[PDB]
Amino acid sequence: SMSVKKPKRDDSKDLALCSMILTEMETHEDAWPFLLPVNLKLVPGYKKVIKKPMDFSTIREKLSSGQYPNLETFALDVRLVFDNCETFNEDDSDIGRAGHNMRKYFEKKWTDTFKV
Numbered sequence: 461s462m463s464v465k466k467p468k469r470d471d472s473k474d475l476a477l478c479s480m481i482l483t484e485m486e487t488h489e490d491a492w493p494f495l496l497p498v499n500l501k502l503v504p505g506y507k508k509v510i511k512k513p514m515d516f517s518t519i520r521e522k523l524s525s526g527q528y529p530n531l532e533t534f535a536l537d538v539r540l541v542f543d544n545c546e547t548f549n550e551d552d553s554d555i556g557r558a559g560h561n562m563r564k565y566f567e568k569k570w571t572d573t574f575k576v
C-alpha cells in the first residue's frame with residue numbers, strides 16, 4: 461500500500477532475456493507457420509475468426525520498439541500466437557502440431573529463464 465513497498469524482482473535483464481527466447485523461437489524448425497502474419501487475403505476465414513492476430517515478427521517489432529511494458533505482456537503475445545493456432549488448425553495438421561510443439565518449447569524456456 462501507500463509507502464509500504466513489497467520487494468520486487470530485478471527486472472533489468474528482462475528485455476535481453478525475452479529477446480534471446482524470441483530468437484530461439486524464430487530459429488526453431490517448427491517456427492515456419494508463425495514467422496510472418498497470416499495472409500488475410502489468402503487464408504479464408506482467418507480475418508473473421510481470429511480477432512487478435514499475432515506472429516513472431518510482430519512480437520519482434522514490438523520488442524525492438526518498447527511496446528511491451530513488462531515481461532508478462534510479452535508472454536501474453538507469445539501465447540496468443542499458439543492460442544490462435546489451436547483455434548484455427550486441427551491438432552494433428554502440420555501447422556497445428558507445430559503450434560503445440562512451439563508452445564511447449566516456449567513454456568519450458570520461460571520457466572527455465574525466469575522461475576529461477
Ligand SMILES: Cn1cc(C(=O)NCCN2CCCC2)ccc1=O
Pocket residue numbers: 492493494498503544545548549555
Ligand atoms: C499460423 N497459421 C499460418 C498459416 C500459413 O499459411 N502460414 C504461411 C506458411 N507459409 C507457407 C510456406 C511457408 C510459410 C495458415 C493458418 C495459421 O493458423
